Coordinates of C-alpha atoms in Angstrom, one line a residue:
Chain A
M1 CA 77.0 -11.2 104.4
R2 CA 77.2 -12.3 108.2
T3 CA 75.9 -9.0 109.6
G4 CA 73.2 -7.9 107.0
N5 CA 70.6 -9.1 104.4
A6 CA 71.5 -8.8 100.5
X7 CA 70.7 -5.4 98.7
Chain B
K5 CA 101.1 -13.0 120.3
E6 CA 100.6 -9.2 120.2
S7 CA 100.1 -7.2 117.0
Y8 CA 98.8 -3.9 115.7
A9 CA 97.9 -5.3 112.2
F10 CA 96.4 -8.5 110.8
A11 CA 96.0 -10.2 107.5
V12 CA 93.9 -13.3 106.7
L13 CA 96.5 -14.6 104.2
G14 CA 100.2 -13.6 104.6
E15 CA 101.7 -10.5 106.2
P16 CA 100.1 -7.0 106.5
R17 CA 101.7 -4.6 104.0
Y18 CA 101.6 -1.7 106.6
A19 CA 103.1 -3.7 109.4
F20 CA 106.0 -1.3 110.1
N21 CA 106.3 2.5 110.4
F22 CA 102.6 2.9 109.4
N23 CA 101.8 6.6 109.2
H24 CA 99.3 6.6 106.3
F25 CA 98.3 4.5 103.4
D26 CA 100.3 4.6 100.1
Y27 CA 97.1 5.6 98.2
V28 CA 96.3 8.8 100.1
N29 CA 97.6 12.4 100.1
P30 CA 98.2 12.9 103.9
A31 CA 98.1 16.7 103.3
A32 CA 94.6 16.5 101.6
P33 CA 92.6 19.6 102.4
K34 CA 89.1 19.5 104.0
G35 CA 86.0 21.1 102.7
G36 CA 83.6 21.1 99.8
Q37 CA 80.7 18.8 98.7
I38 CA 80.6 15.7 96.6
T39 CA 77.1 14.7 95.3
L40 CA 76.4 11.1 94.3
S41 CA 73.5 9.2 92.7
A42 CA 71.8 6.1 93.9
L43 CA 69.3 4.0 92.0
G44 CA 65.9 3.0 93.4
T45 CA 64.7 4.1 96.8
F46 CA 65.3 3.7 100.5
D47 CA 62.9 3.7 103.5
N48 CA 65.0 3.4 106.7
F49 CA 68.5 3.9 108.2
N50 CA 69.2 0.5 109.7
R51 CA 71.4 -1.6 107.4
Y52 CA 71.2 -4.6 109.8
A53 CA 67.4 -5.0 110.1
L54 CA 65.5 -8.1 108.9
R55 CA 63.4 -5.9 106.5
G56 CA 63.4 -2.6 104.7
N57 CA 65.5 -0.8 102.1
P58 CA 68.4 0.8 103.8
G59 CA 69.7 4.2 102.8
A60 CA 73.0 4.8 100.9
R61 CA 76.1 4.5 103.0
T62 CA 74.2 3.2 106.1
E63 CA 76.7 0.4 106.3
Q64 CA 79.4 3.0 107.2
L65 CA 77.6 4.8 110.1
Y66 CA 79.9 3.2 112.7
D67 CA 83.6 2.8 113.2
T68 CA 84.8 -0.8 113.9
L69 CA 87.6 -2.3 116.0
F70 CA 90.0 -2.6 113.0
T71 CA 89.5 -1.4 109.5
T72 CA 90.7 -3.0 106.2
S73 CA 93.1 -1.3 103.8
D74 CA 91.9 -0.9 100.2
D75 CA 95.2 -2.0 98.4
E76 CA 95.2 -5.5 100.0
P77 CA 92.7 -8.4 99.9
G78 CA 92.2 -8.6 103.6
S79 CA 94.4 -6.7 106.0
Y80 CA 93.2 -5.0 109.2
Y81 CA 94.6 -1.9 110.9
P82 CA 93.7 -0.1 114.2
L83 CA 90.6 2.0 114.4
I84 CA 88.5 1.8 117.6
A85 CA 91.1 -0.8 118.8
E86 CA 94.7 0.0 119.4
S87 CA 96.2 -3.5 119.4
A88 CA 95.3 -7.1 120.2
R89 CA 96.8 -10.1 122.0
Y90 CA 96.0 -13.5 120.6
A91 CA 96.6 -17.2 120.4
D92 CA 98.8 -18.7 117.6
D93 CA 95.6 -20.2 116.1
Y94 CA 93.6 -17.0 116.5
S95 CA 90.9 -18.9 118.5
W96 CA 91.0 -16.2 121.2
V97 CA 91.9 -12.6 121.1
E98 CA 92.0 -9.8 123.7
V99 CA 91.4 -6.4 122.0
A100 CA 92.6 -3.1 123.6
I101 CA 90.1 -0.3 123.1
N102 CA 91.4 3.2 122.4
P103 CA 90.5 5.3 125.5
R104 CA 90.0 8.3 123.1
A105 CA 87.2 6.5 121.2
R106 CA 83.9 8.4 121.2
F107 CA 80.4 8.2 119.8
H108 CA 79.0 11.3 118.2
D109 CA 77.4 12.5 121.5
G110 CA 80.9 12.7 123.1
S111 CA 80.4 9.6 125.2
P112 CA 83.1 6.9 125.4
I113 CA 83.2 3.7 123.4
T114 CA 84.0 0.9 125.9
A115 CA 84.5 -2.8 126.0
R116 CA 80.9 -3.1 127.3
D117 CA 79.7 -1.6 124.1
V118 CA 81.5 -4.3 122.1
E119 CA 80.1 -7.1 124.3
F120 CA 76.6 -5.6 124.1
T121 CA 77.0 -5.3 120.3
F122 CA 77.9 -9.0 119.8
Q123 CA 74.9 -10.1 121.9
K124 CA 72.6 -7.8 120.0
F125 CA 73.6 -9.4 116.7
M126 CA 73.4 -12.9 118.2
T127 CA 69.8 -12.4 119.4
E128 CA 68.3 -9.8 117.1
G129 CA 70.6 -9.9 114.0
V130 CA 70.2 -11.6 110.6
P131 CA 69.8 -15.4 111.3
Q132 CA 73.2 -16.3 109.6
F133 CA 75.1 -14.4 112.3
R134 CA 74.2 -16.6 115.2
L135 CA 74.8 -19.7 113.0
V136 CA 78.3 -18.5 112.0
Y137 CA 79.2 -17.5 115.6
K138 CA 77.5 -20.3 117.4
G139 CA 79.7 -21.1 120.4
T140 CA 81.6 -17.7 120.2
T141 CA 81.7 -15.4 123.2
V142 CA 82.6 -11.8 123.4
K143 CA 83.2 -10.5 127.0
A144 CA 84.4 -7.2 128.4
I145 CA 87.1 -8.4 130.8
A146 CA 88.2 -4.8 131.7
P147 CA 86.8 -1.3 131.0
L148 CA 88.8 -1.2 127.7
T149 CA 89.7 -4.8 127.0
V150 CA 87.3 -7.2 125.2
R151 CA 88.1 -10.9 124.9
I152 CA 86.7 -12.9 121.9
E153 CA 86.7 -16.7 122.1
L154 CA 85.8 -19.0 119.2
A155 CA 84.5 -22.6 119.7
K156 CA 86.7 -23.8 116.8
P157 CA 89.6 -22.3 114.7
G158 CA 88.5 -19.7 112.3
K159 CA 91.1 -17.0 111.7
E160 CA 88.9 -15.3 109.1
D161 CA 85.8 -15.5 111.4
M162 CA 87.9 -13.9 114.2
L163 CA 89.2 -11.1 111.9
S164 CA 85.7 -10.5 110.5
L165 CA 84.5 -9.6 114.0
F166 CA 87.0 -6.7 113.8
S167 CA 84.6 -5.3 111.1
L168 CA 81.5 -5.4 113.3
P169 CA 80.0 -1.9 113.8
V170 CA 80.4 -1.0 117.5
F171 CA 76.9 0.1 118.8
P172 CA 76.3 2.5 121.7
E173 CA 74.4 0.5 124.2
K174 CA 72.8 3.8 125.6
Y175 CA 71.0 4.1 122.3
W176 CA 70.5 0.5 121.1
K177 CA 69.0 -0.9 124.3
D178 CA 65.8 0.9 123.2
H179 CA 65.7 -0.4 119.5
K180 CA 65.4 -3.9 118.2
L181 CA 68.3 -4.6 115.7
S182 CA 65.7 -6.4 113.5
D183 CA 63.4 -3.3 113.0
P184 CA 63.9 -0.6 110.4
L185 CA 64.9 2.8 111.7
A186 CA 62.8 5.8 110.5
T187 CA 65.5 8.0 112.0
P188 CA 69.4 7.7 112.0
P189 CA 70.8 5.9 115.1
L190 CA 73.4 7.3 117.4
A191 CA 76.7 6.6 115.5
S192 CA 80.4 7.2 115.5
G193 CA 82.0 7.4 112.0
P194 CA 83.6 10.3 110.3
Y195 CA 80.3 11.2 108.6
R196 CA 76.9 11.7 110.2
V197 CA 73.4 11.9 108.6
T198 CA 72.3 15.5 109.0
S199 CA 69.2 15.7 106.7
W200 CA 67.2 13.5 104.4
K201 CA 64.0 13.1 102.5
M202 CA 62.6 9.5 102.6
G203 CA 63.1 7.9 99.2
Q204 CA 64.8 10.9 97.7
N205 CA 68.0 12.1 99.4
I206 CA 70.4 11.6 102.3
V207 CA 73.0 14.3 103.3
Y208 CA 76.1 13.3 105.3
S209 CA 78.1 15.9 107.0
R210 CA 81.8 15.6 108.1
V211 CA 82.2 15.4 111.9
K212 CA 84.7 18.2 112.3
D213 CA 85.8 17.0 115.8
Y214 CA 86.0 13.3 114.8
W215 CA 88.2 11.7 117.6
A216 CA 90.1 9.5 115.1
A217 CA 90.7 12.1 112.3
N218 CA 94.5 11.7 112.8
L219 CA 94.9 7.9 113.1
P220 CA 97.1 6.5 110.3
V221 CA 94.1 4.7 108.9
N222 CA 92.1 8.0 108.5
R223 CA 94.9 10.3 107.4
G224 CA 94.2 11.9 104.0
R225 CA 90.6 10.4 103.9
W226 CA 87.1 11.8 104.7
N227 CA 88.0 15.2 103.2
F228 CA 84.7 16.5 101.8
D229 CA 82.5 18.5 104.3
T230 CA 79.4 16.9 102.9
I231 CA 78.4 13.9 100.8
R232 CA 74.9 14.0 99.3
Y233 CA 73.1 11.0 97.8
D234 CA 70.2 11.7 95.3
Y235 CA 68.0 8.8 94.3
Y236 CA 66.9 8.2 90.7
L237 CA 64.3 5.7 89.5
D238 CA 66.2 4.5 86.5
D239 CA 69.8 4.7 85.3
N240 CA 69.0 6.5 82.0
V241 CA 67.5 9.5 83.9
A242 CA 70.5 9.3 86.3
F243 CA 72.9 9.4 83.3
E244 CA 71.2 12.4 81.8
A245 CA 71.2 14.2 85.2
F246 CA 75.0 13.5 85.4
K247 CA 75.7 15.1 82.0
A248 CA 73.5 18.1 83.1
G249 CA 75.7 18.4 86.2
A250 CA 73.1 17.3 88.8
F251 CA 75.7 15.1 90.5
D252 CA 79.5 14.9 90.4
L253 CA 80.6 11.3 89.7
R254 CA 79.4 8.4 87.6
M255 CA 80.5 4.8 87.4
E256 CA 79.5 3.8 83.8
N257 CA 78.1 0.3 83.7
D258 CA 76.5 0.6 80.2
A259 CA 78.6 -0.1 77.1
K260 CA 76.5 2.0 74.8
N261 CA 76.7 5.0 77.1
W262 CA 80.5 4.8 77.1
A263 CA 80.8 4.2 73.4
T264 CA 78.4 6.8 72.1
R265 CA 76.9 9.2 74.7
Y266 CA 79.8 11.0 76.5
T267 CA 79.4 13.9 74.1
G268 CA 78.3 17.6 74.2
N270 CA 84.1 19.1 74.6
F271 CA 81.9 17.6 77.2
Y275 CA 83.7 20.1 82.1
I276 CA 83.7 16.4 82.6
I277 CA 86.7 14.1 82.9
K278 CA 86.5 10.6 81.4
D279 CA 88.7 7.8 82.8
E280 CA 89.3 4.2 81.8
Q281 CA 91.8 2.3 83.9
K282 CA 92.0 -1.5 84.1
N283 CA 92.0 -3.5 87.4
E284 CA 94.0 -6.7 87.3
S285 CA 92.2 -7.7 90.6
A286 CA 89.3 -10.0 91.4
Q287 CA 86.1 -9.1 89.6
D288 CA 82.4 -8.7 90.3
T289 CA 80.4 -10.9 87.9
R290 CA 76.9 -10.8 86.6
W291 CA 74.7 -13.9 86.5
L292 CA 71.1 -14.9 86.0
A293 CA 70.0 -17.1 89.0
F294 CA 67.9 -20.2 88.3
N295 CA 65.6 -20.8 91.3
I296 CA 66.3 -24.6 91.3
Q297 CA 63.6 -25.2 94.0
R298 CA 60.9 -24.5 91.5
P299 CA 59.9 -27.4 89.2
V300 CA 60.7 -25.5 85.9
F301 CA 64.4 -25.3 86.8
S302 CA 64.9 -28.5 88.9
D303 CA 66.4 -30.5 85.9
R304 CA 70.1 -29.7 85.1
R305 CA 69.4 -30.4 81.5
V306 CA 66.8 -27.6 81.3
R307 CA 69.2 -25.2 83.0
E308 CA 71.9 -26.2 80.4
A309 CA 69.5 -25.8 77.5
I310 CA 68.3 -22.3 78.6
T311 CA 72.0 -21.3 79.0
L312 CA 72.6 -22.4 75.4
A313 CA 69.8 -20.0 74.3
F314 CA 71.7 -17.0 75.7
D315 CA 73.7 -15.7 72.8
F316 CA 76.4 -13.6 74.4
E317 CA 78.7 -13.2 71.3
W318 CA 75.7 -11.8 69.3
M319 CA 74.9 -9.4 72.2
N320 CA 78.5 -8.3 72.7
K321 CA 78.9 -7.5 69.0
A322 CA 75.5 -6.2 68.0
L323 CA 74.6 -4.3 71.2
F324 CA 77.6 -3.8 73.5
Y325 CA 80.5 -2.7 71.2
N326 CA 82.4 -5.9 72.1
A327 CA 83.1 -4.3 75.5
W328 CA 82.3 -7.2 77.8
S329 CA 84.0 -10.5 78.8
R330 CA 82.0 -13.6 79.5
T331 CA 81.6 -14.5 83.1
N332 CA 83.1 -18.0 83.7
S333 CA 84.2 -18.4 87.3
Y334 CA 83.0 -17.8 90.9
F335 CA 86.6 -16.6 91.5
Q336 CA 86.9 -14.6 88.4
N337 CA 90.4 -13.4 87.5
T338 CA 92.1 -15.0 90.5
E339 CA 94.3 -18.0 90.8
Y340 CA 91.4 -19.8 92.4
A341 CA 89.5 -19.9 89.1
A342 CA 89.3 -23.4 87.6
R343 CA 90.7 -22.5 84.2
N344 CA 93.0 -25.5 83.8
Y345 CA 92.4 -29.3 84.2
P346 CA 92.2 -30.5 87.8
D347 CA 95.5 -31.3 89.3
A348 CA 96.3 -34.2 91.7
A349 CA 95.3 -32.3 94.8
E350 CA 91.9 -31.4 93.3
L351 CA 91.2 -35.0 92.3
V352 CA 91.9 -36.2 95.8
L353 CA 89.2 -33.8 96.9
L354 CA 86.7 -34.6 94.1
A355 CA 87.0 -38.3 93.3
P356 CA 85.3 -39.3 96.6
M357 CA 82.2 -37.6 95.3
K358 CA 82.4 -38.8 91.7
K359 CA 78.9 -40.3 91.7
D360 CA 77.3 -36.9 92.8
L361 CA 79.2 -34.8 90.2
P362 CA 78.7 -34.1 86.5
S363 CA 81.4 -36.2 84.7
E364 CA 82.7 -33.0 83.0
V365 CA 84.2 -31.9 86.3
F366 CA 87.0 -34.5 85.6
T367 CA 87.4 -34.3 81.8
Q368 CA 86.8 -30.7 80.7
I369 CA 87.4 -27.1 81.5
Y370 CA 84.2 -25.2 82.1
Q371 CA 83.3 -23.1 79.1
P372 CA 80.1 -21.1 78.8
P373 CA 78.5 -21.7 75.4
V374 CA 80.1 -19.8 72.5
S375 CA 78.2 -18.8 69.4
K376 CA 79.3 -17.3 66.0
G377 CA 77.8 -13.9 66.8
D378 CA 75.6 -14.1 63.7
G379 CA 72.5 -14.8 65.6
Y380 CA 70.6 -18.1 65.4
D381 CA 73.4 -20.4 66.3
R382 CA 72.4 -23.7 64.8
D383 CA 74.7 -26.0 67.0
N384 CA 73.8 -24.4 70.3
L385 CA 70.0 -24.3 69.6
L386 CA 70.0 -27.9 68.3
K387 CA 71.8 -29.0 71.5
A388 CA 69.2 -27.1 73.6
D389 CA 66.4 -28.9 71.8
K390 CA 68.2 -32.2 72.3
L391 CA 68.5 -31.6 76.1
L392 CA 64.9 -30.3 76.4
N393 CA 63.5 -33.4 74.7
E394 CA 65.5 -35.7 77.0
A395 CA 64.2 -33.8 80.1
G396 CA 60.6 -34.4 78.8
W397 CA 59.8 -30.9 77.3
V398 CA 58.8 -31.4 73.7
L399 CA 57.3 -29.3 71.0
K400 CA 53.5 -29.4 70.4
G401 CA 52.6 -26.8 68.0
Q402 CA 55.1 -24.0 68.5
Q403 CA 55.1 -24.4 72.3
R404 CA 57.3 -26.7 74.4
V405 CA 55.1 -28.9 76.7
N406 CA 55.9 -31.5 79.3
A407 CA 55.7 -34.9 77.6
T408 CA 53.6 -36.5 80.2
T409 CA 51.3 -33.7 81.5
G410 CA 51.1 -31.3 78.5
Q411 CA 51.9 -28.3 80.7
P412 CA 53.7 -25.4 78.8
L413 CA 57.4 -24.7 79.6
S414 CA 57.1 -21.2 81.0
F415 CA 58.8 -19.0 83.6
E416 CA 59.0 -15.4 84.9
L417 CA 62.1 -13.3 84.6
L418 CA 62.0 -10.8 87.5
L419 CA 63.8 -7.5 86.7
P420 CA 64.5 -4.2 88.5
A421 CA 62.9 -1.4 86.5
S422 CA 66.0 0.7 87.3
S423 CA 68.5 -1.3 85.2
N424 CA 69.4 -1.1 81.5
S425 CA 68.0 -4.4 80.2
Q426 CA 68.9 -4.3 76.5
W427 CA 69.7 -8.1 76.6
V428 CA 66.3 -9.1 77.7
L429 CA 64.2 -9.1 74.5
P430 CA 67.0 -10.9 72.5
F431 CA 67.0 -13.6 75.2
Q432 CA 63.1 -13.8 75.2
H433 CA 63.2 -14.1 71.4
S434 CA 65.8 -16.9 71.5
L435 CA 63.7 -18.8 74.0
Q436 CA 60.5 -18.3 72.0
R437 CA 62.3 -20.0 69.0
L438 CA 62.8 -23.0 71.3
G439 CA 59.1 -23.0 72.3
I440 CA 59.9 -21.6 75.8
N441 CA 57.8 -18.8 77.1
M442 CA 59.6 -16.3 79.3
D443 CA 57.4 -13.6 81.0
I444 CA 59.1 -10.3 81.9
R445 CA 58.2 -8.6 85.1
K446 CA 59.8 -5.3 86.1
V447 CA 59.2 -4.0 89.6
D448 CA 60.3 -1.2 91.9
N449 CA 63.4 -1.2 94.2
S450 CA 61.5 -2.2 97.3
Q451 CA 59.8 -5.1 95.5
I452 CA 63.1 -6.3 94.0
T453 CA 64.7 -6.3 97.4
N454 CA 61.9 -8.1 99.2
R455 CA 61.5 -10.7 96.5
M456 CA 65.2 -11.2 96.0
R457 CA 65.6 -11.9 99.8
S458 CA 62.7 -14.4 99.8
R459 CA 63.8 -16.0 96.5
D460 CA 60.2 -15.3 95.2
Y461 CA 61.3 -15.6 91.6
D462 CA 61.9 -18.2 88.8
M463 CA 64.9 -16.2 87.5
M464 CA 66.4 -12.8 88.3
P465 CA 69.8 -11.1 87.8
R466 CA 72.3 -11.4 90.6
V467 CA 75.8 -9.9 91.0
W468 CA 78.4 -12.2 92.5
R469 CA 80.7 -9.8 94.2
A470 CA 84.5 -10.3 93.8
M471 CA 86.0 -12.9 96.1
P472 CA 89.8 -12.7 96.1
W473 CA 90.2 -16.0 98.0
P474 CA 87.8 -18.8 99.1
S475 CA 86.4 -17.0 102.1
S476 CA 84.3 -18.5 104.8
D477 CA 81.5 -16.2 103.6
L478 CA 81.1 -18.9 100.9
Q479 CA 79.0 -21.0 103.4
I480 CA 76.4 -18.1 103.8
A481 CA 75.8 -18.0 100.0
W482 CA 76.0 -21.8 99.2
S483 CA 75.8 -24.1 102.2
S484 CA 72.6 -26.0 103.1
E485 CA 72.0 -24.6 106.5
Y486 CA 72.4 -21.0 105.4
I487 CA 69.7 -21.5 102.7
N488 CA 67.6 -18.5 104.1
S489 CA 70.5 -16.1 104.5
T490 CA 69.2 -14.2 101.4
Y491 CA 72.5 -14.9 99.7
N492 CA 71.7 -18.4 98.3
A493 CA 70.4 -17.2 94.9
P494 CA 69.7 -20.6 93.3
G495 CA 68.3 -22.2 96.4
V496 CA 70.8 -25.0 96.4
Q497 CA 71.2 -27.5 99.2
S498 CA 73.9 -29.9 98.1
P499 CA 76.1 -32.3 100.1
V500 CA 78.9 -31.9 97.5
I501 CA 78.9 -28.1 98.0
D502 CA 78.6 -28.5 101.8
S503 CA 81.5 -30.9 102.1
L504 CA 83.9 -28.7 100.0
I505 CA 82.9 -25.6 101.9
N506 CA 83.3 -27.4 105.3
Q507 CA 86.8 -28.1 104.2
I508 CA 87.3 -24.5 103.1
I509 CA 86.1 -23.1 106.5
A510 CA 88.5 -25.5 108.2
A511 CA 91.4 -24.2 106.0
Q512 CA 91.0 -20.5 106.9
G513 CA 94.3 -18.6 106.6
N514 CA 95.9 -21.5 104.8
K515 CA 96.6 -20.6 101.1
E516 CA 98.3 -23.9 100.2
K517 CA 95.0 -25.8 101.0
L518 CA 92.5 -23.2 99.8
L519 CA 94.1 -23.2 96.3
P520 CA 92.8 -26.6 95.1
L521 CA 89.7 -26.3 97.3
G522 CA 88.6 -23.1 95.6
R523 CA 89.1 -24.5 92.1
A524 CA 87.3 -27.7 93.0
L525 CA 84.3 -25.7 94.3
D526 CA 84.4 -23.5 91.2
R527 CA 84.0 -26.7 89.1
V528 CA 81.0 -27.9 91.1
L529 CA 79.3 -24.5 91.1
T530 CA 79.8 -23.9 87.3
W531 CA 79.3 -27.4 85.9
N532 CA 75.9 -27.7 87.7
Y533 CA 74.5 -24.6 85.9
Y534 CA 73.0 -23.2 89.1
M535 CA 73.2 -19.8 87.5
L536 CA 73.5 -18.5 83.9
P537 CA 76.8 -16.6 83.3
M538 CA 76.5 -13.1 81.9
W539 CA 79.5 -10.7 81.8
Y540 CA 82.1 -8.5 83.5
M541 CA 84.9 -6.3 82.5
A542 CA 88.3 -5.7 84.1
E543 CA 88.0 -2.0 83.4
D544 CA 86.7 0.8 85.7
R545 CA 85.0 3.3 83.5
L546 CA 84.5 6.5 85.5
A547 CA 83.5 10.1 84.7
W548 CA 83.4 13.1 86.9
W549 CA 83.0 16.9 86.9
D550 CA 86.5 18.4 87.1
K551 CA 86.3 19.7 90.7
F552 CA 88.4 17.0 92.5
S553 CA 92.1 16.0 92.9
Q554 CA 93.3 12.6 93.7
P555 CA 96.4 10.9 95.3
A556 CA 99.0 9.6 92.8
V557 CA 98.2 6.0 93.7
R558 CA 94.7 4.3 93.3
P559 CA 94.0 1.4 95.7
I560 CA 93.8 -2.1 94.2
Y561 CA 90.4 -3.1 95.7
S562 CA 88.3 0.1 95.4
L563 CA 88.2 3.3 93.5
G564 CA 89.4 5.2 96.5
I565 CA 86.9 8.1 96.3
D566 CA 87.1 8.5 100.0
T567 CA 90.7 9.7 99.4
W568 CA 89.7 12.4 96.9
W569 CA 89.3 16.0 97.9
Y570 CA 87.6 19.2 96.7
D571 CA 90.1 21.2 94.5
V572 CA 89.1 24.9 94.8
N573 CA 91.3 25.8 91.8
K574 CA 89.7 23.2 89.5
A575 CA 86.2 23.9 90.7
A576 CA 86.6 27.7 90.0
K577 CA 86.9 26.9 86.3
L578 CA 83.4 25.2 86.2
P579 CA 80.0 27.0 85.9

């Protein structure tokens, strides 16, 4: 969650 | 002060004499292909960009400093790093980089790459990263030593930096982290992208000279020579392709499929285990920033119109369990009455809490399963009237303005949505209009990230303990992280999560804090609980063998191998 947007 | 293994809570299981995991066959043979399905589409290879639909497995292109085991909630073992020195409070750590570590082009992975990578995320990464690590520094103090300093204690925040992908500066200096990549980046993991067709397939090939193939953490894993992903626009076409042999492995998420459609001797193996571990849960998110869902009574009434017992009996072969916790099936779930420690935490905020937080256990509505539950629908009518939405004709209308009560349910075309029309029908019998809008995978992703919906389904992924990740999904300043599904900005939530992020690594304190947070999140009806099951329903073509032990926190497919004797018996 800190390094990428939700999928 | 110096270790080779870490755990956020307690002691690492593999702290001594660590040659390989318990859940692998160290002698696993290399070779063969596994072909997997993915639903929807993809359009780029950068999992970390601000936009786009990243390809399958693109979150595993890079090795990290330490890597987590799969039979423990949060334990870290050497990968690119060999060891680390650290303060008692984990507020600084000096990580020793393995001098054999290499990117795919044969060039070394150095401390400078780790420093470059942290600054890349800070300045071009998703906006929550620089918020979480504000005040943190990452500095190469020697060719192969990197020093991490936090501005405040955060043992989990420290350890989670061990999971950062380590970027080659020689490639990434020429590409903004925020831009989609039309082409795979220079990477380092045991599998490399070797061919693809945009929106249709990605082929990964095993790197046969992978520098770390024999580290304890990798022994018995990464056995297939190639891993292929094929994309399918909906799950029903994917399921039929599985039974026709178009791909090798299926995780069955549909109760009706499992109950009635694994037919035809069938050669395909069917497997139902049971995981006693923390569970993913399905929800329907209320966008509480839009007027239609701003009143808690309206959210409660719409939840009452969702007849799960009927759906489970009439549609789903009583396979499912009702979602009822944000820490489902852990000791952090608030399934008993608050104890004294919880009341110390909650009573200061009594005037900003539903009173049921103190007097009742949270229970999603239960119906008789007959359909048309009188009690629940009468209560929904009573709540709707009090909130100012009253029946004129058949339609519910705002008492002062006359505007109809109406909202749009946003849905991925790719999912099985058998529950949707029964829900729409129940709402129509309350005078509530729910429009159904199904859109493609790129639309769903874009709109889910922007919260451009009234309601849509959201999966709350398993959370074995109250992690500091909670702030990204719930705290007010992280409202645009794309993980705050309801759009909530609450000082009650913020205060409890501020306490949780200040109790990192401390189980004794996180235990009543997690239950207290669970009460606040559930009793406010920010989302509508759907279902989960503590079973893994899997099927595969009989061409694989597996270690005797399956890991607790994943299916362990990366420990499987191609079995030439079993494959030989298939067409």
